[PDB]
């Protein structure tokens with residue numbers, strides 16, 4: 001669009017290309033997202049406009065929505081790095097625990113806010129968690145999945161065909177990201193839906209009616225699933241301490257009604273000693 005000078009292709013997102021651009025009437029540097037045709041659905045336009053009001057320090061600001069020439073562009077605040085690259089950058093040492101804790105705490109604050117207004121992300125992953133030089137982390141693309149690819153962070157209720165899923169799906173994803181920050185490997189790197197489900201089962205045990213009432217009646221559940229025994233969390237995420245492991249287990253409860261809420265996770269003892277360190281980042 002005419003008011004924006006693209007400076008660089010930053011990536012191919014879920015919905016289209018993401019550019020770093022500069023606005024000419026403000027001089028502001030932004031992330032420009034092209035979405036994707038019938039002439040942009042009217043409901044998607046209405047959903048997106050609700051998102052313009054969903055403002056929080058831990059949510060990447062939706063600056064503008066440009067519906068022009070029957071195309072849709074989302075203009076976001078720009079951040080220089082994402083958690084995926086920072087994790088790759090931090091592979092030999094690992095992200096220090098104080099920083100992991102600060103990031104998780106801030107992300108939960110973001111989720112708690114969105115969840116309080118009944119907005120889910122649905123597709124959390126390291127690539128859409130954006131970090132700055134101030135030690136802040138922010139959720140990008142919040143609300144876009146409902147308004148409009150890796151399986152690694154997808155909740156089991158989604159994999160099992162539950163169509164009416166809750167905010168709990170975001171808590172699952174963030175637990176997976178938390179484990180990954182700690183161990184420097186992805187928790188459940190599935191490369192198909194069955195492989196994702198079966199990786200989850202191999203670590204947390206195949207779910208049954210005892211841990212997850214109603215599970216065997218879910219659309220894609222099969223009596224023929226193999227029955228793996230649950231592994232111990234001390235084997236899954238060493239050398240995370242007892243507080244972190246305790247929290248992680250609650251974030252990874254099979255039953256979405258049992259799974260910890262963002263708001264209850266913020267009160268967890270793990271965060272008793274949270275701080276806000278600044279990361280070392282080269283831009």
Ligand SMILES: Nc1cncc(Cl)n1
Nearest residue numbers: 031076077078079140
């Ligand atoms: N890659 C980027 C940078 N800033 C904001 C967004 Cl939404 N994406």
